Design a protein around this ligand. Structure first.
Ligand SMILES: OC[C@H]1O[C@H](O[C@@H]2[C@@H](O)[C@H](O)O[C@H](CO)[C@@H]2O)[C@H](O)[C@@H](O)[C@H]1O
Ligand SMILES: OC[C@H]1O[C@H](O[C@@H]2[C@@H](O)[C@H](O)O[C@H](CO)[C@@H]2O)[C@H](O)[C@@H](O)[C@H]1O
Ligand SMILES: [Ca+2]
Ligand SMILES: [Cl-]
Ligand SMILES: [Cl-]
Ligand SMILES: [Cl-]
Ligand SMILES: [Cl-]
Ligand SMILES: [Cl-]
Ligand SMILES: [Cl-]
Ligand SMILES: [Cl-]
Lengths: 582, 584
């Protein structure tokens, strides 16, 4: 009809049977008659791999390859999916949602989770030099092979069944471990990622598994998280689509990012949450949300982003390195980071910034006349006029876009690994009424043209009426609000990558003298009407003795109109900037 | 015009520079004007990943996914590629050739190799309880991380460069090891695969010697240990949905998987070519030398050398698809079973399908398809013109009735490889003539099953004539020199007749013990005549074998009196009398 009921196509709740193909037929009928809504009777729905559509997908900042997709929303328009607060359980390697060249899509009232997490967790029962003793719950199946290696499994165990289980070992490969505080259910204070690779020596003590690595260190009683090595199955992919809304969507887990958007226009996530399911301390294995080369309005409103293994959000562009200079008008650009391969974005009549790599200073803006994709890495680009004579190979290009207007309000950011928000948004950005409790920098202006190759550089930011409670209590960043753009030291005085930032009306609850602001190459920033409250939530770090570290900047104002409470010193010292951590 | 010189498009020999993009433009020009030949000035040409065309590919019996292709021959026609005996070096994860919906393609006069093999080799310098001491040459770079695990690298080592190299580790993952005899450069006598997984505990002694730890490690000092590549991502030449393809004087030194893999293709010829290791290596391709899946017309392997590969020299078979769901009396959903079979679409309307009982490989009936709908890379819904056999159950399998390929395999040399020689799963007219076999596994194996590999076999017209089987089946990959191992349960061996009409004549069998020359079951009409059987002492005799002919559940089998046996102690009457067991 106008509204389609999935149960009319065979998708039946609370049975544990695969509803993938019944859902697919309901989707095709909705496209056939132009139905405006698809609804689920409230219940549990399970989705498996065997009948899910297969498509080749390049997904920015995630792993490319063949994807089995449960909701293949390719070229859909004016469609709402209302789950009625149903529970969606995905079995194996599945991408729940991919929105590809779709328009006006509303996802509403359901939860996403996987039958077995791609990461793994264990209770730390013992510890010593070069080892940890671990106890695994049943929902993290594993085995120790004859080589003495710990390998997590999709399930415990004929020959063809064993072969299928053997092929699933890739999905649950680890690469590092991170210790989580048991009581606070957050990354352990000042703990760092401990790299291990995908092969840890292990042996069962003769229910306790002992793992061996010379860099292992953790507190007994805490939770050890095995970080998933891959990002193959993000929760919701928004690709080349527009006007997408997520309302009351719970993403309990994903093989990578919860929501990843690329080259998409107008995206809203509201009243949703990324939070672990029962028996887990971690939600998604990568960023909660992420936006690449997106335009229009990006709205994160009244969400809860917690316990994921990476940043809550990152809104940025793509830098493509200048690999080959052919003639004075033609260049061949190359995508650099492996998870950026296959990102096509340079089209004829586009305007490109021609940026110096080590400085992030734009030489000029040139217009593209022709574009030719050679591979998933290299694209040949010819300009309308000869480009700047100073451009060398190793510099980078970036697309001049109608940069996304960022509206991030009412969100809770806590318990996650790494940073809170990477504000690489050059458009008008508003960060209002958010709560931060992150081990890394609550807010970070990053971007570089040497590794990540992410285009950042703000020009209109307002950070107002937020609460920063005991954030940056570890080492993922350089302060509560910090700049860490990829600018060489010899260019910091010359470059001005981030401009026009207002930080007002916020409350900073801090436990030591870590930098509240750590800025370089910033032009025009005002810090006024904020409250700085001293706490004793974590042990004080002797590394830091300055709340405001400022270098190679101009027009920075740490106004007298700021209230400080609980400190022994006064504004004369604590509000005076330094060049070092002091 | 008619002949395009690739150097006219910037492909320069003997420079080490990437010629991928120059070659691509020469290919597009040949298609634009209908050129008939592309020539390479004789020299060395290097191809890299950075500018290779990317396509999704499903390659049967190999690993699917994104492929970077150096020669993307998609919808090319009447084109010859003459390398003039050039050397093509491929750096990293590249598929050298993919022929997709192409016709009348001839490849001749060049060699294919990779700058670093996907497998690894080492000299065994020492041994002890639960370990092996290994010495790796410079062309097999490796790392031992802080976890103490051996991880082979694309090269020895900037932050971005370290990330690129680290991502290459997946390409060189291992899963098992095999011992090779140093002097004879073959799998060690009676040695078997030793499973390890992709993670071996290792430590560098003092450096230069690496000690690997595993309780099942066992090998002779002085021999060579081969680390089997875990993946089959980069086969040498892929022939997919194409027709009339010829390979002449093609040297495939290495591949990430199979040398030549053909699927759903008509008329293929491989002549005067060879699969053999490059300098400093004991192994060539990491999987089958040649392989043909659902192929039709004529398959010709003429005067080739297939040696040192980690699998069979050839396998010519069809695809069994299991009946996963019965919708109604006319409608089923079939499912591809083996992971390296996913994405193999082959059922179309008007196709006729065999409907086969799984455990017996006995065909209930043939039925014609009216409707076909691909659901995933595993499941396809099929509707038939008439209600199918009432005895058909979920778990049985279907197979496409095809104009099964006529197989002509003449003048080849098959030796030094792992596993078997030729898997004769070809139901079409098959001729095996004037070949030389020296395989650790069965020289000729009739296999097929509908429970794991899901490969359709079952011959109907085989002539094995004037071949030389010298000291073959000297290890354990099979059940004899010429053996059947079709997936037929013992319950049904007596009523199932999967292989029919086989003639084995004029051959010379040089054997070192009394392992079975023929090990047959479920065979009807076989004649073994005019053969010469000669006793050797090349390998130690195996006491568990005491019968040259082991025959069970068969009919019309003739081990004729006109065969000749030399060098044995027992009488001719006793040596030609078949048994049901390996001994008595
Ligand atoms: O900074 C850009 C980068 O951030 C996220 O990931 C990295 C992670 O890969 C690394 O190991 O740690 C840092 C924290 O120190 C970040 O978490 C994004 O997932 C990634 O796509 C990229 O955007
Ligand atoms: O038998 C069918 C099968 O044969 C080949 O490989 C297998 C190999 O995977 C296994 O480990 O050992 C056997 C020998 O005992 C064969 O070498 C083909 O590569 C495979 O595609 C399939 O056709
Ligand atoms: Ca064709
Ligand atoms: Cl305010
Ligand atoms: Cl103080
Ligand atoms: Cl600093
Ligand atoms: Cl300092
Ligand atoms: Cl040594
Ligand atoms: Cl015995
Ligand atoms: Cl006699």
């Amino acid at each position: 009809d106008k509204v389609i009921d999935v149960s009319d196509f065979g998708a039946i709740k609370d049975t544990g049977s695969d509803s993938t193909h019944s859902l697919y037929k309901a989707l095709q009928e909705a496209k056939k008659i132009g139905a405006t809504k698809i609804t689920f009777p409230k219940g549990r729905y399970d989705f498996y791999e065997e009948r899910a559509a297969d498509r080749l997908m390049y997904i920015s900042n995630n792993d490319p390859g063949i994807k089995r997709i449960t909701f293949p929303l390719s070229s859909f328009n004016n469609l709402e999916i209302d789950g009625n607060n149903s529970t969606f359980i995905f079995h194996g390697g599945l991408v729940p949602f991919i929105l590809d060249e779709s328009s006006h899509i509303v996802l509403r009232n359901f939860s996403i989770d996987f039958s077995r997490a791609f990461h793994s967790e264990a209770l730390i029962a013992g510890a010593g030099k070069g080892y940890l003793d671990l106890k695994f719950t049943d929902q993290f199946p594993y085995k120790i092979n004859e080589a003495g290696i710990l390998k997590f499994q999709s399930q415990l165990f004929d020959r063809l069944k064993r072969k299928q289980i053997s092929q699933d070992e890739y999905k649950y490969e680890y690469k590092r471990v991170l210790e989580f505080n048991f009581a606070l259910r957050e990354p352990e204070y000042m703990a760092q990622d401990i790299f291990t690779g995908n092969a840890l020596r292990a042996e069962k003590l003769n229910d306790v598994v002992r793992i061996f690595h010379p860099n292992l260190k953790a507190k007994v009683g805490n939770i050890l998280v095995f970080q998933a090595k891959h990002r193959d199955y993000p929760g919701v992919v928004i690709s080349d689509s527009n006007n997408v809304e997520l309302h009351n969507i719970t993403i309990h887990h994903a093989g990578g990012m919860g929501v990843i958007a690329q080259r998409s226009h107008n995206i809203t996530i509201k009243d949703s949450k990324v939070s672990p399911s029962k028996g887990r301390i971690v939600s998604t294995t990568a960023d909660a949300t992420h936006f690449v080369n997106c335009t229009g309005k990006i709205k994160l409103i009244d969400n809860l982003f917690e316990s994921q293994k990476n940043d809550a959000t990152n809104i940025h562009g793509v830098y493509a390195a200048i690999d080959k200079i052919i003639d004075d008008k033609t260049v061949e650009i190359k995508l650099q980071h492996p998870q950026q391969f296959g990102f096509d974005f340079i089209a004829p009549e586009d305007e490109l910034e021609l940026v110096h790599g080590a400085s992030l200073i734009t030489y000029e803006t040139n217009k593209v006349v022709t574009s030719t994709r050679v591979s998933n890495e290299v694209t040949r680009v010819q300009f309308i006029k000869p480009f700047d004579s100073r451009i060398k190979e190793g510099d980078s290009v970036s697309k001049v876009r109608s940069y996304a207007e960022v509206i991030i309000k009412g969100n809770i950011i806590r318990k996650n690994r790494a940073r809170g928000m990477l504000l690489n948004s050059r458009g008008k950005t508003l960060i209002e009424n958010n709560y931060f409790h992150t081990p890394g920098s609550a807010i970070l202006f990053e971007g570089d043209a040497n590794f990540w190759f992410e285009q950042g550089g703000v020009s209109d930011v307002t950070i107002k009426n937020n609460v920063f409670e005991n954030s940056f209590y570890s080492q993922w960043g350089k302060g509560i609000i910090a700049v860490d753009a990829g600018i060489d030291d010899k260019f910091k005085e010359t470059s001005r990558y981030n401009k026009n930032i207002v930080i007002k009306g916020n409350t900073f609850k801090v436990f030591d003298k870590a930098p509240i602001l750590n800025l370089f190459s910033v032009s025009n920033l005002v810090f006024e009407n904020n409250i700085i409250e001293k706490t004793t939530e974590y042990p004080e770090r002797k590394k830091y003795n300055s709340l405001f570290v400022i270098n190679n900047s101009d027009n920075i104002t740490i106004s007298i109109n700021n209230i400080l409470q609980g400190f022994s010193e006064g504004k004369s010292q604590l509000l005076s900037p330094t060049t070092t951590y002091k």
